[PDB]
PDB file of all heavy atoms in Angstrom:
ATOM      1  N   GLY A 203     -50.037 -19.987  30.468  1.00 53.52           N
ATOM      2  CA  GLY A 203     -48.932 -20.633  31.176  1.00 53.52           C
ATOM      3  C   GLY A 203     -47.691 -20.885  30.342  1.00 53.52           C
ATOM      4  O   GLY A 203     -47.602 -20.461  29.184  1.00 53.52           O
ATOM      5  N   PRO A 204     -46.675 -21.540  30.938  1.00 51.86           N
ATOM      6  CA  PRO A 204     -45.445 -21.824  30.175  1.00 51.86           C
ATOM      7  C   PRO A 204     -45.628 -22.847  29.038  1.00 51.86           C
ATOM      8  O   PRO A 204     -46.586 -23.624  29.033  1.00 51.86           O
ATOM      9  CB  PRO A 204     -44.491 -22.362  31.243  1.00 51.86           C
ATOM     10  CG  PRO A 204     -45.382 -22.906  32.320  1.00 51.86           C
ATOM     11  CD  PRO A 204     -46.601 -22.061  32.323  1.00 51.86           C
ATOM     12  N   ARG A 205     -44.717 -22.807  28.050  1.00 50.22           N
ATOM     13  CA  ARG A 205     -44.648 -23.733  26.931  1.00 50.22           C
ATOM     14  C   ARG A 205     -43.574 -24.778  27.302  1.00 50.22           C
ATOM     15  O   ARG A 205     -42.403 -24.437  27.430  1.00 50.22           O
ATOM     16  CB  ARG A 205     -44.340 -22.983  25.624  1.00 50.22           C
ATOM     17  CG  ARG A 205     -45.603 -22.589  24.875  1.00 50.22           C
ATOM     18  CD  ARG A 205     -45.547 -21.188  24.353  1.00 50.22           C
ATOM     19  NE  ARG A 205     -46.882 -20.711  23.962  1.00 50.22           N
ATOM     20  CZ  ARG A 205     -47.321 -20.638  22.710  1.00 50.22           C
ATOM     21  NH1 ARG A 205     -46.539 -21.007  21.702  1.00 50.22           N
ATOM     22  NH2 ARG A 205     -48.543 -20.184  22.455  1.00 50.22           N
ATOM     23  N   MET A 206     -43.984 -26.033  27.554  1.00 51.35           N
ATOM     24  CA  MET A 206     -43.077 -27.094  28.002  1.00 51.35           C
ATOM     25  C   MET A 206     -42.679 -28.087  26.923  1.00 51.35           C
ATOM     26  O   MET A 206     -43.466 -28.386  26.040  1.00 51.35           O
ATOM     27  CB  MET A 206     -43.647 -27.846  29.225  1.00 51.35           C
ATOM     28  CG  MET A 206     -44.189 -26.938  30.309  1.00 51.35           C
ATOM     29  SD  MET A 206     -45.102 -27.796  31.627  1.00 51.35           S
ATOM     30  CE  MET A 206     -46.574 -28.413  30.687  1.00 51.35           C
ATOM     31  N   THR A 207     -41.458 -28.611  27.021  1.00 50.92           N
ATOM     32  CA  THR A 207     -40.879 -29.617  26.121  1.00 50.92           C
ATOM     33  C   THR A 207     -40.038 -30.582  26.948  1.00 50.92           C
ATOM     34  O   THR A 207     -39.692 -30.265  28.089  1.00 50.92           O
ATOM     35  CB  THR A 207     -39.978 -28.973  25.011  1.00 50.92           C
ATOM     36  OG1 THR A 207     -39.019 -28.097  25.600  1.00 50.92           O
ATOM     37  CG2 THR A 207     -40.758 -28.226  23.962  1.00 50.92           C
ATOM     38  N   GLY A 208     -39.683 -31.718  26.355  1.00 49.01           N
ATOM     39  CA  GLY A 208     -38.801 -32.698  26.975  1.00 49.01           C
ATOM     40  C   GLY A 208     -39.354 -33.429  28.177  1.00 49.01           C
ATOM     41  O   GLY A 208     -40.554 -33.380  28.451  1.00 49.01           O
ATOM     42  N   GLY A 209     -38.460 -34.094  28.890  1.00 50.03           N
ATOM     43  CA  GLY A 209     -38.790 -34.900  30.053  1.00 50.03           C
ATOM     44  C   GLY A 209     -39.681 -36.042  29.630  1.00 50.03           C
ATOM     45  O   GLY A 209     -39.390 -36.747  28.654  1.00 50.03           O
ATOM     46  N   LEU A 210     -40.825 -36.156  30.296  1.00 50.81           N
ATOM     47  CA  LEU A 210     -41.803 -37.198  29.998  1.00 50.81           C
ATOM     48  C   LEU A 210     -42.548 -36.986  28.659  1.00 50.81           C
ATOM     49  O   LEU A 210     -43.074 -37.958  28.133  1.00 50.81           O
ATOM     50  CB  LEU A 210     -42.772 -37.402  31.183  1.00 50.81           C
ATOM     51  CG  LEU A 210     -44.039 -36.537  31.375  1.00 50.81           C
ATOM     52  CD1 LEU A 210     -44.637 -36.840  32.733  1.00 50.81           C
ATOM     53  CD2 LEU A 210     -43.750 -35.049  31.350  1.00 50.81           C
ATOM     54  N   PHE A 211     -42.572 -35.746  28.102  1.00 51.61           N
ATOM     55  CA  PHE A 211     -43.209 -35.443  26.804  1.00 51.61           C
ATOM     56  C   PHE A 211     -42.346 -35.870  25.604  1.00 51.61           C
ATOM     57  O   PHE A 211     -42.870 -36.026  24.500  1.00 51.61           O
ATOM     58  CB  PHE A 211     -43.550 -33.944  26.678  1.00 51.61           C
ATOM     59  CG  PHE A 211     -44.554 -33.401  27.671  1.00 51.61           C
ATOM     60  CD1 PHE A 211     -44.196 -32.400  28.572  1.00 51.61           C
ATOM     61  CD2 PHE A 211     -45.878 -33.848  27.669  1.00 51.61           C
ATOM     62  CE1 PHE A 211     -45.133 -31.884  29.480  1.00 51.61           C
ATOM     63  CE2 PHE A 211     -46.812 -33.329  28.575  1.00 51.61           C
ATOM     64  CZ  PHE A 211     -46.437 -32.346  29.463  1.00 51.61           C
ATOM     65  N   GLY A 212     -41.035 -36.031  25.833  1.00 50.40           N
ATOM     66  CA  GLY A 212     -40.055 -36.375  24.806  1.00 50.40           C
ATOM     67  C   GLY A 212     -39.905 -35.270  23.775  1.00 50.40           C
ATOM     68  O   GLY A 212     -40.252 -34.109  24.048  1.00 50.40           O
ATOM     69  N   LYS A 213     -39.443 -35.629  22.561  1.00 50.32           N
ATOM     70  CA  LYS A 213     -39.249 -34.652  21.484  1.00 50.32           C
ATOM     71  C   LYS A 213     -39.949 -35.069  20.175  1.00 50.32           C
ATOM     72  O   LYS A 213     -39.549 -36.056  19.529  1.00 50.32           O
ATOM     73  CB  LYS A 213     -37.744 -34.353  21.287  1.00 50.32           C
ATOM     74  CG  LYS A 213     -37.389 -33.432  20.117  1.00 50.32           C
ATOM     75  CD  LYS A 213     -35.933 -32.930  20.161  1.00 50.32           C
ATOM     76  CE  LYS A 213     -34.874 -33.974  19.860  1.00 50.32           C
ATOM     77  NZ  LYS A 213     -34.350 -34.619  21.098  1.00 50.32           N
ATOM     78  N   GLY A 214     -40.993 -34.298  19.831  1.00 50.25           N
ATOM     79  CA  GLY A 214     -41.796 -34.454  18.626  1.00 50.25           C
ATOM     80  C   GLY A 214     -42.820 -35.573  18.547  1.00 50.25           C
ATOM     81  O   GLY A 214     -42.963 -36.391  19.461  1.00 50.25           O
ATOM     82  N   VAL A 215     -43.542 -35.584  17.419  1.00 52.29           N
ATOM     83  CA  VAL A 215     -44.569 -36.552  17.027  1.00 52.29           C
ATOM     84  C   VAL A 215     -43.966 -37.422  15.901  1.00 52.29           C
ATOM     85  O   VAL A 215     -43.404 -36.894  14.935  1.00 52.29           O
ATOM     86  CB  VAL A 215     -45.882 -35.819  16.583  1.00 52.29           C
ATOM     87  CG1 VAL A 215     -46.854 -36.770  15.912  1.00 52.29           C
ATOM     88  CG2 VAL A 215     -46.561 -35.140  17.762  1.00 52.29           C
ATOM     89  N   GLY A 216     -44.076 -38.740  16.057  1.00 53.87           N
ATOM     90  CA  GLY A 216     -43.543 -39.701  15.100  1.00 53.87           C
ATOM     91  C   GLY A 216     -44.522 -40.796  14.738  1.00 53.87           C
ATOM     92  O   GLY A 216     -45.612 -40.890  15.313  1.00 53.87           O
ATOM     93  N   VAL A 217     -44.139 -41.621  13.749  1.00 56.46           N
ATOM     94  CA  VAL A 217     -44.910 -42.778  13.285  1.00 56.46           C
ATOM     95  C   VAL A 217     -44.530 -43.932  14.230  1.00 56.46           C
ATOM     96  O   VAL A 217     -43.336 -44.182  14.432  1.00 56.46           O
ATOM     97  CB  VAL A 217     -44.608 -43.137  11.792  1.00 56.46           C
ATOM     98  CG1 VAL A 217     -45.455 -44.311  11.313  1.00 56.46           C
ATOM     99  CG2 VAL A 217     -44.802 -41.933  10.873  1.00 56.46           C
ATOM    100  N   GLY A 218     -45.541 -44.597  14.802  1.00 55.91           N
ATOM    101  CA  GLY A 218     -45.361 -45.747  15.681  1.00 55.91           C
ATOM    102  C   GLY A 218     -45.251 -47.013  14.851  1.00 55.91           C
ATOM    103  O   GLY A 218     -46.096 -47.271  13.993  1.00 55.91           O
ATOM    104  N   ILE A 219     -44.154 -47.766  15.036  1.00 55.40           N
ATOM    105  CA  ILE A 219     -43.837 -48.998  14.291  1.00 55.40           C
ATOM    106  C   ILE A 219     -43.455 -50.060  15.323  1.00 55.40           C
ATOM    107  O   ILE A 219     -43.027 -49.696  16.416  1.00 55.40           O
ATOM    108  CB  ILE A 219     -42.664 -48.726  13.268  1.00 55.40           C
ATOM    109  CG1 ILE A 219     -42.984 -47.549  12.305  1.00 55.40           C
ATOM    110  CG2 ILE A 219     -42.279 -49.964  12.447  1.00 55.40           C
ATOM    111  CD1 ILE A 219     -41.872 -46.513  12.198  1.00 55.40           C
ATOM    112  N   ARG A 220     -43.599 -51.366  14.983  1.00 55.37           N
ATOM    113  CA  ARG A 220     -43.177 -52.465  15.862  1.00 55.37           C
ATOM    114  C   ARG A 220     -41.653 -52.458  15.911  1.00 55.37           C
ATOM    115  O   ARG A 220     -41.010 -52.119  14.917  1.00 55.37           O
ATOM    116  CB  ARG A 220     -43.665 -53.825  15.339  1.00 55.37           C
ATOM    117  CG  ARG A 220     -45.102 -54.134  15.690  1.00 55.37           C
ATOM    118  CD  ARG A 220     -45.519 -55.523  15.220  1.00 55.37           C
ATOM    119  NE  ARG A 220     -45.558 -55.635  13.757  1.00 55.37           N
ATOM    120  CZ  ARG A 220     -46.593 -55.287  12.993  1.00 55.37           C
ATOM    121  NH1 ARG A 220     -47.691 -54.781  13.539  1.00 55.37           N
ATOM    122  NH2 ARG A 220     -46.537 -55.440  11.678  1.00 55.37           N
ATOM    123  N   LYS A 221     -41.077 -52.836  17.051  1.00 55.88           N
ATOM    124  CA  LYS A 221     -39.622 -52.876  17.225  1.00 55.88           C
ATOM    125  C   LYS A 221     -38.902 -53.833  16.235  1.00 55.88           C
ATOM    126  O   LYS A 221     -37.825 -53.494  15.736  1.00 55.88           O
ATOM    127  CB  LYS A 221     -39.256 -53.180  18.681  1.00 55.88           C
ATOM    128  CG  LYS A 221     -39.515 -51.999  19.606  1.00 55.88           C
ATOM    129  CD  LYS A 221     -39.150 -52.318  21.036  1.00 55.88           C
ATOM    130  CE  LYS A 221     -38.801 -51.074  21.802  1.00 55.88           C
ATOM    131  NZ  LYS A 221     -38.143 -51.391  23.093  1.00 55.88           N
ATOM    132  N   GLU A 222     -39.520 -54.977  15.907  1.00 56.63           N
ATOM    133  CA  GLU A 222     -38.952 -55.955  14.972  1.00 56.63           C
ATOM    134  C   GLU A 222     -39.022 -55.513  13.478  1.00 56.63           C
ATOM    135  O   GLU A 222     -38.402 -56.162  12.628  1.00 56.63           O
ATOM    136  CB  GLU A 222     -39.570 -57.359  15.181  1.00 56.63           C
ATOM    137  CG  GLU A 222     -41.082 -57.421  14.987  1.00 56.63           C
ATOM    138  CD  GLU A 222     -41.911 -57.311  16.252  1.00 56.63           C
ATOM    139  OE1 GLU A 222     -41.641 -56.406  17.077  1.00 56.63           O
ATOM    140  OE2 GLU A 222     -42.847 -58.128  16.407  1.00 56.63           O
ATOM    141  N   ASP A 223     -39.762 -54.422  13.164  1.00 54.56           N
ATOM    142  CA  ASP A 223     -39.902 -53.893  11.798  1.00 54.56           C
ATOM    143  C   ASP A 223     -38.893 -52.767  11.462  1.00 54.56           C
ATOM    144  O   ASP A 223     -39.289 -51.691  11.026  1.00 54.56           O
ATOM    145  CB  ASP A 223     -41.354 -53.448  11.527  1.00 54.56           C
ATOM    146  CG  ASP A 223     -42.372 -54.561  11.383  1.00 54.56           C
ATOM    147  OD1 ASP A 223     -41.960 -55.739  11.266  1.00 54.56           O
ATOM    148  OD2 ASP A 223     -43.575 -54.253  11.316  1.00 54.56           O
ATOM    149  N   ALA A 224     -37.589 -53.052  11.627  1.00 54.53           N
ATOM    150  CA  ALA A 224     -36.454 -52.146  11.376  1.00 54.53           C
ATOM    151  C   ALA A 224     -36.403 -51.585   9.944  1.00 54.53           C
ATOM    152  O   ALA A 224     -36.003 -50.433   9.759  1.00 54.53           O
ATOM    153  CB  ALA A 224     -35.147 -52.859  11.694  1.00 54.53           C
ATOM    154  N   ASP A 225     -36.800 -52.397   8.946  1.00 55.51           N
ATOM    155  CA  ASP A 225     -36.828 -52.014   7.532  1.00 55.51           C
ATOM    156  C   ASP A 225     -37.927 -50.984   7.244  1.00 55.51           C
ATOM    157  O   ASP A 225     -37.677 -50.021   6.517  1.00 55.51           O
ATOM    158  CB  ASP A 225     -36.959 -53.254   6.618  1.00 55.51           C
ATOM    159  CG  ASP A 225     -35.779 -54.224   6.687  1.00 55.51           C
ATOM    160  OD1 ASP A 225     -34.616 -53.751   6.737  1.00 55.51           O
ATOM    161  OD2 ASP A 225     -36.017 -55.459   6.643  1.00 55.51           O
ATOM    162  N   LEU A 226     -39.134 -51.180   7.822  1.00 55.81           N
ATOM    163  CA  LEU A 226     -40.254 -50.247   7.674  1.00 55.81           C
ATOM    164  C   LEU A 226     -39.927 -48.878   8.332  1.00 55.81           C
ATOM    165  O   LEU A 226     -40.311 -47.835   7.800  1.00 55.81           O
ATOM    166  CB  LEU A 226     -41.552 -50.864   8.231  1.00 55.81           C
ATOM    167  CG  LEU A 226     -42.868 -50.069   8.068  1.00 55.81           C
ATOM    168  CD1 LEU A 226     -43.203 -49.802   6.577  1.00 55.81           C
ATOM    169  CD2 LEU A 226     -44.012 -50.795   8.732  1.00 55.81           C
ATOM    170  N   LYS A 227     -39.176 -48.896   9.450  1.00 57.83           N
ATOM    171  CA  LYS A 227     -38.725 -47.699  10.159  1.00 57.83           C
ATOM    172  C   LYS A 227     -37.728 -46.915   9.287  1.00 57.83           C
ATOM    173  O   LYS A 227     -37.810 -45.693   9.217  1.00 57.83           O
ATOM    174  CB  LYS A 227     -38.097 -48.061  11.523  1.00 57.83           C
ATOM    175  CG  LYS A 227     -37.948 -46.842  12.436  1.00 57.83           C
ATOM    176  CD  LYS A 227     -36.973 -47.053  13.583  1.00 57.83           C
ATOM    177  CE  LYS A 227     -35.817 -46.065  13.563  1.00 57.83           C
ATOM    178  NZ  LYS A 227     -36.228 -44.654  13.854  1.00 57.83           N
ATOM    179  N   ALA A 228     -36.796 -47.621   8.636  1.00 60.75           N
ATOM    180  CA  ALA A 228     -35.788 -47.040   7.751  1.00 60.75           C
ATOM    181  C   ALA A 228     -36.458 -46.358   6.541  1.00 60.75           C
ATOM    182  O   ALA A 228     -36.057 -45.250   6.171  1.00 60.75           O
ATOM    183  CB  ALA A 228     -34.811 -48.118   7.295  1.00 60.75           C
ATOM    184  N   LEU A 229     -37.499 -47.010   5.962  1.00 61.08           N
ATOM    185  CA  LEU A 229     -38.301 -46.505   4.840  1.00 61.08           C
ATOM    186  C   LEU A 229     -39.035 -45.220   5.244  1.00 61.08           C
ATOM    187  O   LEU A 229     -38.982 -44.243   4.500  1.00 61.08           O
ATOM    188  CB  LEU A 229     -39.319 -47.562   4.368  1.00 61.08           C
ATOM    189  CG  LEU A 229     -38.814 -48.635   3.402  1.00 61.08           C
ATOM    190  CD1 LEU A 229     -39.629 -49.909   3.525  1.00 61.08           C
ATOM    191  CD2 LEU A 229     -38.823 -48.136   1.957  1.00 61.08           C
ATOM    192  N   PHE A 230     -39.709 -45.220   6.421  1.00 66.59           N
ATOM    193  CA  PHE A 230     -40.428 -44.056   6.957  1.00 66.59           C
ATOM    194  C   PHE A 230     -39.482 -42.882   7.223  1.00 66.59           C
ATOM    195  O   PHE A 230     -39.822 -41.754   6.881  1.00 66.59           O
ATOM    196  CB  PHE A 230     -41.224 -44.420   8.231  1.00 66.59           C
ATOM    197  CG  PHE A 230     -42.667 -44.812   7.990  1.00 66.59           C
ATOM    198  CD1 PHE A 230     -43.083 -46.131   8.144  1.00 66.59           C
ATOM    199  CD2 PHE A 230     -43.620 -43.855   7.642  1.00 66.59           C
ATOM    200  CE1 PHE A 230     -44.424 -46.494   7.935  1.00 66.59           C
ATOM    201  CE2 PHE A 230     -44.960 -44.217   7.433  1.00 66.59           C
ATOM    202  CZ  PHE A 230     -45.349 -45.535   7.578  1.00 66.59           C
ATOM    203  N   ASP A 231     -38.291 -43.148   7.799  1.00 64.80           N
ATOM    204  CA  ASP A 231     -37.289 -42.128   8.098  1.00 64.80           C
ATOM    205  C   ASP A 231     -36.755 -41.438   6.836  1.00 64.80           C
ATOM    206  O   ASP A 231     -36.598 -40.219   6.833  1.00 64.80           O
ATOM    207  CB  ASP A 231     -36.147 -42.717   8.940  1.00 64.80           C
ATOM    208  CG  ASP A 231     -36.514 -42.987  10.396  1.00 64.80           C
ATOM    209  OD1 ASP A 231     -37.648 -42.649  10.798  1.00 64.80           O
ATOM    210  OD2 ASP A 231     -35.657 -43.529  11.136  1.00 64.80           O
ATOM    211  N   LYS A 232     -36.510 -42.214   5.768  1.00 63.59           N
ATOM    212  CA  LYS A 232     -36.052 -41.723   4.470  1.00 63.59           C
ATOM    213  C   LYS A 232     -37.156 -40.847   3.828  1.00 63.59           C
ATOM    214  O   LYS A 232     -36.853 -39.761   3.326  1.00 63.59           O
ATOM    215  CB  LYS A 232     -35.681 -42.911   3.554  1.00 63.59           C
ATOM    216  CG  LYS A 232     -35.014 -42.522   2.234  1.00 63.59           C
ATOM    217  CD  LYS A 232     -34.704 -43.746   1.369  1.00 63.59           C
ATOM    218  CE  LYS A 232     -33.929 -43.410   0.108  1.00 63.59           C
ATOM    219  NZ  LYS A 232     -34.821 -42.989  -1.006  1.00 63.59           N
ATOM    220  N   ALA A 233     -38.427 -41.319   3.869  1.00 65.54           N
ATOM    221  CA  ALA A 233     -39.588 -40.603   3.331  1.00 65.54           C
ATOM    222  C   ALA A 233     -39.867 -39.287   4.096  1.00 65.54           C
ATOM    223  O   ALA A 233     -40.127 -38.269   3.452  1.00 65.54           O
ATOM    224  CB  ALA A 233     -40.815 -41.499   3.344  1.00 65.54           C
ATOM    225  N   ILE A 234     -39.761 -39.304   5.446  1.00 64.83           N
ATOM    226  CA  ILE A 234     -39.947 -38.132   6.314  1.00 64.83           C
ATOM    227  C   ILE A 234     -38.868 -37.083   6.041  1.00 64.83           C
ATOM    228  O   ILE A 234     -39.201 -35.910   5.910  1.00 64.83           O
ATOM    229  CB  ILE A 234     -40.068 -38.515   7.821  1.00 64.83           C
ATOM    230  CG1 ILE A 234     -41.415 -39.195   8.092  1.00 64.83           C
ATOM    231  CG2 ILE A 234     -39.906 -37.299   8.731  1.00 64.83           C
ATOM    232  CD1 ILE A 234     -41.486 -40.010   9.375  1.00 64.83           C
ATOM    233  N   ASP A 235     -37.593 -37.509   5.925  1.00 65.49           N
ATOM    234  CA  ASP A 235     -36.461 -36.622   5.611  1.00 65.49           C
ATOM    235  C   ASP A 235     -36.660 -35.888   4.275  1.00 65.49           C
ATOM    236  O   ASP A 235     -36.395 -34.692   4.198  1.00 65.49           O
ATOM    237  CB  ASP A 235     -35.120 -37.391   5.615  1.00 65.49           C
ATOM    238  CG  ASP A 235     -34.590 -37.727   7.005  1.00 65.49           C
ATOM    239  OD1 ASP A 235     -34.728 -36.879   7.919  1.00 65.49           O
ATOM    240  OD2 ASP A 235     -33.989 -38.813   7.167  1.00 65.49           O
ATOM    241  N   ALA A 236     -37.162 -36.597   3.251  1.00 63.01           N
ATOM    242  CA  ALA A 236     -37.440 -36.039   1.927  1.00 63.01           C
ATOM    243  C   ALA A 236     -38.646 -35.076   1.938  1.00 63.01           C
ATOM    244  O   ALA A 236     -38.590 -34.032   1.275  1.00 63.01           O
ATOM    245  CB  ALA A 236     -37.652 -37.161   0.913  1.00 63.01           C
ATOM    246  N   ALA A 237     -39.712 -35.404   2.711  1.00 63.90           N
ATOM    247  CA  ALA A 237     -40.909 -34.566   2.835  1.00 63.90           C
ATOM    248  C   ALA A 237     -40.612 -33.256   3.594  1.00 63.90           C
ATOM    249  O   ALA A 237     -41.203 -32.216   3.291  1.00 63.90           O
ATOM    250  CB  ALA A 237     -42.031 -35.339   3.511  1.00 63.90           C
ATOM    251  N   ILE A 238     -39.676 -33.305   4.558  1.00 68.86           N
ATOM    252  CA  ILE A 238     -39.249 -32.124   5.305  1.00 68.86           C
ATOM    253  C   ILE A 238     -38.422 -31.220   4.374  1.00 68.86           C
ATOM    254  O   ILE A 238     -38.715 -30.030   4.262  1.00 68.86           O
ATOM    255  CB  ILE A 238     -38.490 -32.486   6.623  1.00 68.86           C
ATOM    256  CG1 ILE A 238     -39.426 -33.161   7.647  1.00 68.86           C
ATOM    257  CG2 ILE A 238     -37.834 -31.241   7.244  1.00 68.86           C
ATOM    258  CD1 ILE A 238     -38.696 -33.845   8.845  1.00 68.86           C
ATOM    259  N   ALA A 239     -37.411 -31.804   3.698  1.00 67.28           N
ATOM    260  CA  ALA A 239     -36.486 -31.121   2.797  1.00 67.28           C
ATOM    261  C   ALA A 239     -37.141 -30.374   1.618  1.00 67.28           C
ATOM    262  O   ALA A 239     -36.640 -29.308   1.259  1.00 67.28           O
ATOM    263  CB  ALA A 239     -35.440 -32.100   2.283  1.00 67.28           C
ATOM    264  N   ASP A 240     -38.221 -30.924   1.009  1.00 70.01           N
ATOM    265  CA  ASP A 240     -38.861 -30.283  -0.148  1.00 70.01           C
ATOM    266  C   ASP A 240     -40.002 -29.290   0.225  1.00 70.01           C
ATOM    267  O   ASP A 240     -40.587 -28.669  -0.668  1.00 70.01           O
ATOM    268  CB  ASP A 240     -39.328 -31.330  -1.187  1.00 70.01           C
ATOM    269  CG  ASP A 240     -40.450 -32.273  -0.782  1.00 70.01           C
ATOM    270  OD1 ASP A 240     -40.882 -32.223   0.388  1.00 70.01           O
ATOM    271  OD2 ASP A 240     -40.895 -33.064  -1.640  1.00 70.01           O
ATOM    272  N   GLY A 241     -40.264 -29.133   1.525  1.00 70.48           N
ATOM    273  CA  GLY A 241     -41.266 -28.209   2.048  1.00 70.48           C
ATOM    274  C   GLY A 241     -42.693 -28.723   2.168  1.00 70.48           C
ATOM    275  O   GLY A 241     -43.594 -27.938   2.482  1.00 70.48           O
ATOM    276  N   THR A 242     -42.908 -30.038   1.928  1.00 72.99           N
ATOM    277  CA  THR A 242     -44.209 -30.721   2.020  1.00 72.99           C
ATOM    278  C   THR A 242     -44.787 -30.685   3.457  1.00 72.99           C
ATOM    279  O   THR A 242     -45.974 -30.400   3.624  1.00 72.99           O
ATOM    280  CB  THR A 242     -44.087 -32.165   1.475  1.00 72.99           C
ATOM    281  OG1 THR A 242     -43.607 -32.103   0.141  1.00 72.99           O
ATOM    282  CG2 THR A 242     -45.399 -32.941   1.523  1.00 72.99           C
ATOM    283  N   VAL A 243     -43.960 -30.988   4.480  1.00 75.02           N
ATOM    284  CA  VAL A 243     -44.413 -30.976   5.871  1.00 75.02           C
ATOM    285  C   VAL A 243     -44.809 -29.537   6.295  1.00 75.02           C
ATOM    286  O   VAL A 243     -45.799 -29.365   6.996  1.00 75.02           O
ATOM    287  CB  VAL A 243     -43.421 -31.651   6.863  1.00 75.02           C
ATOM    288  CG1 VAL A 243     -44.005 -31.686   8.268  1.00 75.02           C
ATOM    289  CG2 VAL A 243     -43.063 -33.060   6.421  1.00 75.02           C
ATOM    290  N   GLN A 244     -44.049 -28.526   5.846  1.00 73.08           N
ATOM    291  CA  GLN A 244     -44.315 -27.118   6.113  1.00 73.08           C
ATOM    292  C   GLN A 244     -45.639 -26.670   5.448  1.00 73.08           C
ATOM    293  O   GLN A 244     -46.423 -25.952   6.076  1.00 73.08           O
ATOM    294  CB  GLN A 244     -43.121 -26.263   5.642  1.00 73.08           C
ATOM    295  CG  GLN A 244     -43.338 -24.755   5.734  1.00 73.08           C
ATOM    296  CD  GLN A 244     -42.171 -23.974   5.203  1.00 73.08           C
ATOM    297  OE1 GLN A 244     -41.481 -23.271   5.947  1.00 73.08           O
ATOM    298  NE2 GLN A 244     -41.922 -24.076   3.902  1.00 73.08           N
ATOM    299  N   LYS A 245     -45.874 -27.108   4.189  1.00 75.05           N
ATOM    300  CA  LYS A 245     -47.075 -26.811   3.403  1.00 75.05           C
ATOM    301  C   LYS A 245     -48.327 -27.424   4.054  1.00 75.05           C
ATOM    302  O   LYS A 245     -49.365 -26.770   4.094  1.00 75.05           O
ATOM    303  CB  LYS A 245     -46.909 -27.306   1.948  1.00 75.05           C
ATOM    304  CG  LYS A 245     -48.047 -26.908   1.005  1.00 75.05           C
ATOM    305  CD  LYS A 245     -48.328 -27.970  -0.064  1.00 75.05           C
ATOM    306  CE  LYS A 245     -49.247 -29.074   0.426  1.00 75.05           C
ATOM    307  NZ  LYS A 245     -49.346 -30.206  -0.536  1.00 75.05           N
TER     308      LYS A 245
END
């Protein structure tokens, strides 16, 4: 069948954090950006 994206499925898989933990989200985003950039996520 078809390959579906968006709508109710949204875009991608992420780390689930509490809404009040803005600092922990910022730390995870910085770490994820660096892991993508150096080829770790691809590996």
Side-chain angles (χ1 to χ4, degrees):
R205 267 136 195 258
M206 314 171 294
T207 52
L210 85 189
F211 297 118
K213 175 167 71 266
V215 168
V217 182
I219 305 131
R220 279 183 293 275
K221 287 180 154 193
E222 60 264 47
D223 289 348
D225 296 319
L226 184 60
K227 195 198 120 68
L229 277 153
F230 267 109
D231 286 356
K232 188 181 185 275
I234 288 161
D235 284 322
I238 293 167
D240 67 355
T242 303
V243 184
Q244 174 183 246
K245 186 214 84 189

